[PDB]
Scaffold this active site. Structure first.
Site, PDB file in Angstrom:
ATOM      1  N   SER A 144       0.276  -1.118   0.263  1.00  0.00           N
ATOM      2  CA  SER A 144       0.213  -0.268  -0.093  1.00  0.00           C
ATOM      3  C   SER A 144       0.884   1.619  -0.286  1.00  0.00           C
ATOM      4  O   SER A 144       2.238   1.438  -0.716  1.00  0.00           O
ATOM      5  CB  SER A 144      -1.271  -0.181   1.101  1.00  0.00           C
ATOM      6  OG  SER A 144      -2.374   0.945   1.422  1.00  0.00           O
ATOM      7  N   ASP A 198      -7.130  -3.604  -7.604  1.00  0.00           N
ATOM      8  CA  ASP A 198      -7.279  -3.455  -6.597  1.00  0.00           C
ATOM      9  C   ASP A 198      -7.169  -2.051  -6.907  1.00  0.00           C
ATOM     10  O   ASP A 198      -6.012  -1.165  -8.036  1.00  0.00           O
ATOM     11  CB  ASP A 198      -5.773  -3.216  -6.135  1.00  0.00           C
ATOM     12  CG  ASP A 198      -5.168  -2.417  -4.957  1.00  0.00           C
ATOM     13  OD1 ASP A 198      -5.282  -1.533  -4.834  1.00  0.00           O
ATOM     14  OD2 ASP A 198      -3.987  -3.067  -5.122  1.00  0.00           O
TER      15      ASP A 198
END
Length: 297
Positions: A144, A198
């Protein structure tokens, strides 16, 4: 061309443990043993991964640690992502500052500020466990936003003299055309893994200058909450502005951002249909951009 390999995939399944570990060992005291609850990073615990130092940038939320692996004979630098990612998406953090890594280098404020807030400690720790284990190689990880900052520390640690190898998962684009190129061309590998659709690996938008590092090891599946991908589910798209994989996908499958071979989160202001439309809109712009530059270069 470029492809994936047996051990290349093994490394992939192995580093998110350090990625998911950053989510709770970024407070650990030296000598402590990297540890995760919820099977967050069993392999890391199986080997003797120990902390050389942990650090946190109060003003920015960044957090990270440097550990040594007696078994793997390596030194890893792990930075933690956002404990509140859907929040980060709603705020659309795109402002980009100037960077001094290459001529005309542009970078995302936050990521660079975060790196700057904890760089000194980060650096020394790598050195401290570098002198103490002169044979070990180094690796920079992060899932992330954690991965974004992971790329910079890689880039800087390198110019610092110590060679690297950056492993990222669900990382957002971190800089612009020339910063991405610099790191790409920088000796060493930058294996960034993306999961299905994602939504963060496609931000900030291509239309806003932000490019990526090549290659891209995309996990082609439904993902969702999938964990069982294999070498044969991998695709490999090369190039700064390539949308034949993650970028170019749609939706708001945040669940996928939270799943890379395992649960990321193991350790620990607008609607939904809304956030999803805005995000789609962007990848819809990014494609029109690529479309209209087809006949260029």
């Amino acid at each position: 061309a470029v492809s994936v390999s047996t051990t290349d995939f093994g490394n992939f399944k192995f580093y998110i443990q350090h990625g998911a570990a950053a989510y709770c060992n970024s407070e650990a005291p030296a000598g402590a043993k990297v540890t995760c609850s919820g099977n967050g990073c069993p392999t890391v615990q199986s080997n003797g991964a120990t902390i050389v130092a942990s650090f946190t940038g109060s003003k920015t939320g960044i957090g990270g640690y440097v550990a040594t692996d007696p078994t793997r004979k390596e030194i890893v630098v792990s930075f933690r992502g956002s404990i509140n990612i859907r929040n980060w998406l709603t705020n659309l953090d795109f402002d980009q500052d100037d960077c001094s890594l290459t001529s005309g280098c542009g970078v995302h404020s936050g990521f660079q500020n975060a790196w700057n807030e904890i760089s000194a400690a980060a650096t020394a720790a790598v050195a401290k466990a570098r002198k103490a284990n002169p044979s070990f190689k180094v690796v920079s990880v992060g899932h992330s936003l954690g991965g974004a900052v992971a790329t910079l520390a890689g880039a800087n640690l390198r110019i610092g003299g110590t060679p690297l190898d950056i492993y990222t998962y669900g990382s957002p684009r971190v800089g612009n055309t020339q910063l991405a190129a610099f790191v790409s061309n920088q000796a060493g590998g930058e294996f960034r893994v993306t999961n299905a659709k994602d939504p963060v690996p496609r931000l900030p938008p291509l239309i806003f200058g932000y490019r990526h590092t090549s290659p891209e090891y995309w996990l082609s599946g439904s993902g969702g909450d999938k964990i069982d991908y294999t070498i044969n589910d991998v695709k490999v798209c090369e190039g700064a502005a390539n949308l034949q994989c993650n970028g170019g996908t749609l939706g708001l499958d945040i669940d996928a951002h939270l799943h890379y071979f395992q649960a990321t989160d193991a350790c620990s202001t607008m609607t939904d249909a809304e956030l999803e439309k805005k995000l789609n809109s962007y990848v819809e712009m990014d494609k029109e951009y690529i479309k209209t530059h087809a006949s260029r270069s």
